[PDB]
Amino acid sequence: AGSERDYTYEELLNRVFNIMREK
Amino acid sequence: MEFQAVVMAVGGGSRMTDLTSSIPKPLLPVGNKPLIWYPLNLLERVGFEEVIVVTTRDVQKALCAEFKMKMKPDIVCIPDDADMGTADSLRYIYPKLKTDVLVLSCDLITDVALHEVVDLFRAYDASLAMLMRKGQDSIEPVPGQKGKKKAVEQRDFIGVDSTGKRLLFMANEADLDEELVIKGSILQKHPRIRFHTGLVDAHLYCLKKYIVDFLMENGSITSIRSELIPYLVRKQFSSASSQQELKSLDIYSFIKEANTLNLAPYDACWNACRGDRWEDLSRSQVRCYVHIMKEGLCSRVSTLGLYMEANRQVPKLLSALCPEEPPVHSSAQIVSKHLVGVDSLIGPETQIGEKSSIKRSVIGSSCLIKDRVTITNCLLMNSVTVEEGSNIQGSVICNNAVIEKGADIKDCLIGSGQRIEAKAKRVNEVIVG
Amino acid sequence: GLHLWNSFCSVDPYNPQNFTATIQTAA
Amino acid sequence: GVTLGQPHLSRQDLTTLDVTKLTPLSHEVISRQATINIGTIGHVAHGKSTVVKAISGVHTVRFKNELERNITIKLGYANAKIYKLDDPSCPRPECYRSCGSSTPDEFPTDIPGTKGNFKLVRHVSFVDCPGHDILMATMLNGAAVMDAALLLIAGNESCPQPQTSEHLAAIEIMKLKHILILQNKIDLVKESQAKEQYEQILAFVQGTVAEGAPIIPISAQLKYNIEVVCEYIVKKIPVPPRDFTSEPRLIVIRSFDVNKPGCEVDDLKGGVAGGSILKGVLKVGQEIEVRPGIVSKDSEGKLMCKPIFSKIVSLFAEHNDLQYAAPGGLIGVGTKIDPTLCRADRMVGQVLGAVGALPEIFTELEISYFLLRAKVQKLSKNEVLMVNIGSLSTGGRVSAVKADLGKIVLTNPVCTEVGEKIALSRRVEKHWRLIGWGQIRRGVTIKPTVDDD
Amino acid sequence: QAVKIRADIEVACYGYEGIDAVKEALRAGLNCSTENMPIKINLIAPPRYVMTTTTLERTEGLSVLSQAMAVIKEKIEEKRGVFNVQMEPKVVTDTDETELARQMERLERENAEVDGDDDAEEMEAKAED
Numbered sequence A: 001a002g003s004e005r006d007y008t009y010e011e012l013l014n015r016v017f018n019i020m021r022e023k
Numbered sequence B: 001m002e003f004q005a006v007v008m009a010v011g012g013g014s015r016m017t018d019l020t021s022s023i024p025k026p027l028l029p030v031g032n033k034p035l036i037w038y039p040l041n042l043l044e045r046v047g048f049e050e051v052i053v054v055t056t057r058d059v060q061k062a063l064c065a066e067f068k069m070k071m072k073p074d075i076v077c078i079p080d081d082a083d084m085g086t087a088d089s090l091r092y093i094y095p096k097l098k099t100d101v102l103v104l105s106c107d108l109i110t111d112v113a114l115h116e117v118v119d120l121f122r123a124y125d126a127s128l129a130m131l132m133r134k135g136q137d138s139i140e141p142v143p144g145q146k147g148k149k150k151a152v153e154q155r156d157f158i159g160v161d162s163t164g165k166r167l168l169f170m171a172n173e174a175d176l177d178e179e180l181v182i183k184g185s186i187l188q189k190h191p192r193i194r195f196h197t198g199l200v201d202a203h204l205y206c207l208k209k210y211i212v213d214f215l216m217e218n219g220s221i222t223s224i225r226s227e228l229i230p231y232l233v234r235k236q237f238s239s240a241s242s243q244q245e246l247k248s249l250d251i252y253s254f255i256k257e258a259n260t261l262n263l264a265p266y267d268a269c270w271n272a273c274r275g276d277r278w279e280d281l282s283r284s285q286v287r288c289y290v291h292i293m294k295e296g297l298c299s300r301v302s303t304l305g306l307y308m309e310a311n312r313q314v315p316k317l318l319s320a321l322c323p324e325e326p327p328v329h330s331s332a333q334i335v336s337k338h339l340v341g342v343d344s345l346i347g348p349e350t351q352i353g354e355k356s357s358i359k360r361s362v363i364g365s366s367c368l369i370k371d372r373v374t375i376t377n378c379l380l381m382n383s384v385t386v387e388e389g390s391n392i393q394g395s396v397i398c399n400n401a402v403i404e405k406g407a408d409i410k411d412c413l414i415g416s417g418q419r420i421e422a423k424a425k426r427v428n429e430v431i432v433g
Numbered sequence C: 001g002l003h004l005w006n007s008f009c010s011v012d013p014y015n016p017q018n019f020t021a022t023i024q025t026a027a
Numbered sequence D: 001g002v003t004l005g006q007p008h009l010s011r012q013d014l015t016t017l018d019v020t021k022l023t024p025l026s027h028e029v030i031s032r033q034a035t036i037n038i039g040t041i042g043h044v045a046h047g048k049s050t051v052v053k054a055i056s057g058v059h060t061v062r063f064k065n066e067l068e069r070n071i072t073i074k075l076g077y078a079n080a081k082i083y084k085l086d087d088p089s090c091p092r093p094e095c096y097r098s099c100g101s102s103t104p105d106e107f108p109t110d111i112p113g114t115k116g117n118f119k120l121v122r123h124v125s126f127v128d129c130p131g132h133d134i135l136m137a138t139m140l141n142g143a144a145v146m147d148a149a150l151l152l153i154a155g156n157e158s159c160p161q162p163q164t165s166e167h168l169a170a171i172e173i174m175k176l177k178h179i180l181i182l183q184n185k186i187d188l189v190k191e192s193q194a195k196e197q198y199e200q201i202l203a204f205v206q207g208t209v210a211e212g213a214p215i216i217p218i219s220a221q222l223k224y225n226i227e228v229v230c231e232y233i234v235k236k237i238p239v240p241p242r243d244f245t246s247e248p249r250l251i252v253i254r255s256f257d258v259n260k261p262g263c264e265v266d267d268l269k270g271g272v273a274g275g276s277i278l279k280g281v282l283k284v285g286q287e288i289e290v291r292p293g294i295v296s297k298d299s300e301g302k303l304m305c306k307p308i309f310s311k312i313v314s315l316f317a318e319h320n321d322l323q324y325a326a327p328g329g330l331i332g333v334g335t336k337i338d339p340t341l342c343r344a345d346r347m348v349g350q351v352l353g354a355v356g357a358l359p360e361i362f363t364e365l366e367i368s369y370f371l372l373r374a375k376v377q378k379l380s381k382n383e384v385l386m387v388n389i390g391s392l393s394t395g396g397r398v399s400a401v402k403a404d405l406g407k408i409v410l411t412n413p414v415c416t417e418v419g420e421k422i423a424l425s426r427r428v429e430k431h432w433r434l435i436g437w438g439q440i441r442r443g444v445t446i447k448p449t450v451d452d453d
Numbered sequence E: 001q002a003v004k005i006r007a008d009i010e011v012a013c014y015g016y017e018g019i020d021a022v023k024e025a026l027r028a029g030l031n032c033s034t035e036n037m038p039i040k041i042n043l044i045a046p047p048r049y050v051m052t053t054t055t056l057e058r059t060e061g062l063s064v065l066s067q068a069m070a071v072i073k074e075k076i077e078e079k080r081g082v083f084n085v086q087m088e089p090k091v092v093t094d095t096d097e098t099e100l101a102r103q104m105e106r107l108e109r110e111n112a113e114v115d116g117d118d119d120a121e122e123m124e125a126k127a128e129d
Helices: A009-021 B037-046 B057-062 B086-092 B115-124 B209-217 B224-235 B305-313 B316-321 D048-055 D132-140 D162-174 D191-205 D227-235 E019-032 E058-077 E094-111
Strands: B004-009 B052-055 B101-104 B108-110 B130-134 B157-160 B167-171 B290-293 B298-300 D036-041 D076-082 D122-128 D148-151 D179-184 D215-218 D249-256 D272-279 D312-316 D331-335 D364-371 D384-388 D393-401 D405-409 D421-428 D431-444 E003-013 E039-045 E048-055 E081-091
Touching: A009 D215, A009 D227, B004 B037, B004 B086, B037 B108, B052 B057, B086 B209, B086 B224, B115 B290, B167 B224, B209 B224, B298 B305, D036 D048, D048 D122, D132 D162, D132 D421, D132 D431, D179 D191, D191 D215, D215 D227, D384 D431, E003 E019, E003 E058, E019 E039, E019 E058, E019 E081, E039 E058, E039 E094, E048 E058, E058 E081
Parallel strands: B004 B052, B004 B101, B130 B290, D036 D122, D036 D148, D148 D179, D179 D215
Antiparallel strands: B108 B298, B157 B167, D076 D122, D249 D272, D272 D331, D312 D331, D364 D405, D364 D431, D384 D393, D384 D421, D393 D405, D421 D431, E003 E048, E003 E081, E039 E048
């Protein structure tokens, strides 16, 4: 999420997982 | 021209809710032929070639082009919604009918001859004719109801007078409490009558176009066999001296008939049909009568006990109806015949082996059998996979029944895809599924 | 004509994949 | 040609009428019509209708009593215009705005804290089907045109079902690699089960052209936590190259009539037929024909053929009014044929093309078949079965077999070019499960019944 | 003292003119209308049409409608069309109107396009035997 050109799968997994569960 | 038969199969016919099943009732193939095509056989036999059959589109998709009768079937898709009354169903198809009607149910399995009813109809030219039977005392092994269950039903009273022809009174005790009542003035004309209790109806009714014409305008009428016939039998004498439109549309209004010759002449009426007086039989306000038989088989399938009885009690009528159809079927891969009950049926795509004695019962398609198997006075039905160590004593089976090994059962009633372990018993048929 | 008919459906003559009607009449 | 529809998009000019565009990336197509069609697969336990509606809305229609045919394939489709949000600093999917086709080509940003005017990427149509084998059977023989595909791989289930294996077998047959696998039900699935499903996905995508495809999880059952797809529908944007100018050919997938009872004489309209245009550019006021036409078994038994023709008067897509249509997506035409022939999808499986573009019309043919499953019996000699071509199902009659070759006659006339594909299914159990497919080798022409008065 | 008369007609065309043929033909009929008896060109479902007329004299109305579909028949025959007469001119009652309206509404309901977004199909059994 820090960059724009391509992204790491597991970074986005952790980000969305944290967003959906706690906030 | 003479008649226009109608077969009524709108969901339940009279009341499907009395029993529970996964298949629509007309679609149910008891005796390896679907039940609705038993009345069709007699309809063809008497000489009819037109059947206006009313049914849901689901069943029309369901029977999947099985049999091609030589009739002229005209299937009409009833609206699905929830349910419509019989009178409403007759209302929906009004434009097609032109002559008299011969309304029929979709569950009548019978051996009667249709000669007597039409004979009386042509003879006494009345407005009704019913086929009725003395109530059959039903004694048989219980339908898996744990042998402990009783029900209370109305004791209907039906007052045929003297000769077993003219019907004058019909009612039931459901609304009554202790004792019945009569108008009284009838006894001054017919001093001696008699009563019958616990009989069997048929829904095989012959009507006349005035009845349906009157029915169409009236909106309070919803069922044919529930209120219409009692209303007719009541009006047979109620206000008969008062009369014999624009006020509840009196039934007496729509009766106009005479004797005039135009393309269909008639002979001199002085001595043509029992001519003794100046005029005997030319005018009729309303007349209701029945033909009461005393023996044979004229049943209808509306419960589960009737289901077992009809399944087990029509193996011999099939041979008389279709003498060129053997009870065995060459399409089935029969292994042995010496251990097969002669008084039993078997369908296509069946596998058997040692000790596969299907005794006095029925079996359907895709059936697979192994050693130590009997279907003794039972009903196995479609896509059944059974192996060694099996036995039944009479029940209902359906699609995807499975028996693995050593399952010896008595009165095994089972639903779709219900796996059964070894060494199981079903002394009470219950439901399971 | 034989024990083969089995209607099972509408036989409408205007089906363009099975046309059994006056198709194209003229003078 | 000329196409505005709504004031949101500008109007094209019917003056130049030049095929020199020849580009999927044109200003008045990426905003106007969905020339890029994408499929979605996954069989059971996912409910792709929900995720498709999440971007477009309610899709697919029926008629209950289809009448006449009752065999037309129940393929559904929808349109959506993807337009990424423009922001100097967008923490993706903050550079996302994609929604339906109502919004104009370049919408003025109204997001809190930022302004501007964001453009779109490319109009995209989505295609699906609520049946398992019918969808692969239909796109096997070149009926469903697509450039990419998506998979839902249901997360509320066990290890990938044999439905997945069928799906990879089909796509391997199709020689396409632009397939995005999208994990499902991440909301109900916990971290450990998500890792297990991810490992299974990697262990099962190997050995296929879909290996290495982007995998991303979506909580589609609740239609919530949809951010990841909201960003990679823009990020994952492979180029769908396309050729446009050639000759107009079309396959009719459905037909109907818009007239209502009680309509007066002056307000009578012709029937409408909707299908997919394969190649070429269709023009308003152009000349179009349908080769098979009306079939009529005469006293000889030969058909009537009669490739009837009528000038096209009106064309449209979805709700807009478009002229000079282009290949891609699904389009309907309000031809001038009498509605008594165009009512209730009377005849499906036809062809539509310009004058002089009538292909061969063979009824006896030879094919090259391929088996798919492991062990299987060879093709049966003198057998009755069902054949599926374009969007059309019929009961053929195979005559001869040269081991791995077959020559077969058809009970109904068929309009096809030699070298296309074919599907074969055998009547078994209480239905016809598909057995195989093939490519037509050569065809003996039927009697040339193309004639006119 | 008036009366209602109804007739049933079938018209179609399969040449190159198309629907523009029959639309041209049908508007010929009301072009031949007399000054006082009016005729309504109504459609209930293609390729069927219903003729309805209010009148006071039976013979003139029936004769004028007869020559009406006669000229329509010749005109459509000039275009390689079809022409069928099914229900002859006949006096009409209120019950006939009510039943025709009922069947009209029923068929309009049937012809309507129903939603088919359902994601489940009955397709494991499609045999025809």
